[PDB]
Design a protein around this nucleic acid. Structure first.
Lengths: 49, 48
RNA sequence: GGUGUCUUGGGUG
C-alpha cells in the first residue's frame, strides 16, 4: 500500500443490538379489535406507523 | 353498538366490558332509580 | 379458522 496503516490492538465491546432482533416484515396479519388496523409490535407481527 | 365498545379477553376465559359499557350500565342504574321516585313517595330531597 | 387492554422505569435512531 502506498500509505502506511495505523495498526494495533484495541478493546472492543459486543453490544446487545443485533440486526436479527430488529429485522421485521409484514405482508398481512392480525388487526386490532377496535380499529381493525394492524397491531403494534414486532413480536406480535404488527405493522409500521 | 358493541363495535364501539368491544370486549377483550384477560385469561383465556374472562372478559371485561369496555369503559363505555360499564358507564352505560351505571347510567341505566341511575335512570331506574329515577323511575323509582316519580312512581311513589319521594320527599324532594332524593329526586334531586 | 380465529395469538387482548393501560401505565412506570431503562435504551436505540
Amino acid at each position: 500500500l502506498m500509505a502506511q496503516v495505523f495498526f494495533g490492538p484495541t478493546y472492543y465491546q459486543r453490544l446487545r443490538h443485533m440486526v436479527d432482533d430488529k429485522i421485521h416484515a409484514r405482508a398481512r396479519g392480525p388487526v386490532q379489535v377496535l380499529t381493525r388496523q394492524p397491531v403494534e409490535g414486532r413480536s406480535r407481527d404488527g405493522g409500521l406507523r | 353498538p358493541p363495535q364501539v365498545r368491544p370486549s377483550i379477553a384477560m385469561d383465556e376465559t374472562t372478559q371485561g366490558q369496555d369503559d363505555l359499557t360499564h358507564k352505560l350500565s351505571d347510567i341505566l342504574k341511575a335512570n331506574i332509580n329515577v323511575q323509582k321516585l316519580e312512581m311513589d313517595g319521594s320527599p324532594q330531597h332524593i329526586i334531586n
